[PDB]
Amino acid sequence: GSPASGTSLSAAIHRTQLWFHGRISREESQRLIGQQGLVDGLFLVRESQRNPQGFVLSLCHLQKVKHYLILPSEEEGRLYFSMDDGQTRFTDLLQLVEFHQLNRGILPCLLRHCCTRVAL
Amino acid sequence: PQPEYVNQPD
């Protein structure tokens, strides 16, 4: 298993305009970030302070928003994640940059994305 | 199953 420990903590190391966060109630997250009326292209990069090895890519589709977090930079590969029904557990950053134009955004919708509208 | 997340409930 995995989920066992964790109570109340806070960590957010930033020195620029980074759009990375830790434990953000994904359930309630879609209530806030799911107010944006943009296309399935407004994504964020935060995960959990509960999942030791947990990174999620958040989207902002034109109905809702999501959180893809299951596997981080491991020694068996790199960014190990996909979607509700995908298997792309490989590179991300480098791919995201270039493929930002036409990558694997959200499940079956506007795969194209850019940034999010929350902080800056 | 129980969680939510994606790729799997986590």
Determine, for residues A83 and B5 on separate chains, whether the beta-carbon distance falls below 8 Å: no
Contact with chain B for residue A51, Cβ under 8 A = yes
A89 within 8 A of A16, measured Cβ to Cβ:
no
- The C-alpha of B1 sits at a distance from chain A's nearest C-alpha, in angstroms, of 13
Q: Tell me the C-alpha distance between A120 and A118, whole Å.
A: 6
Q: Do B6 and A66 touch (CB under 8 A)?
A: yes
Q: How far apart are CA A55 and CA A79, in angstroms?
A: 8
The structure's method of determination equals NMR
Task: Compute the C-alpha angle A100/A101/A102, nearest 5°.
Answer: 95
SS3 A60: strand
Q: In this structure, what are the phi and psi dihedrals at residue A97, rounded to the nearest 5 degrees? A: -45, -65
**CATH architecture, domain defined by A1-120:** 2-Layer Sandwich (3.30)
Q: How far apart are CA A103 and CA A43, in angstroms?
A: 12
| Cβ atoms B5, A70 nearer than 8 A | yes
- Residue A73, beta-bridge partner list: A79
At A91, give phi and psi (nearest 5°).
-45, 165
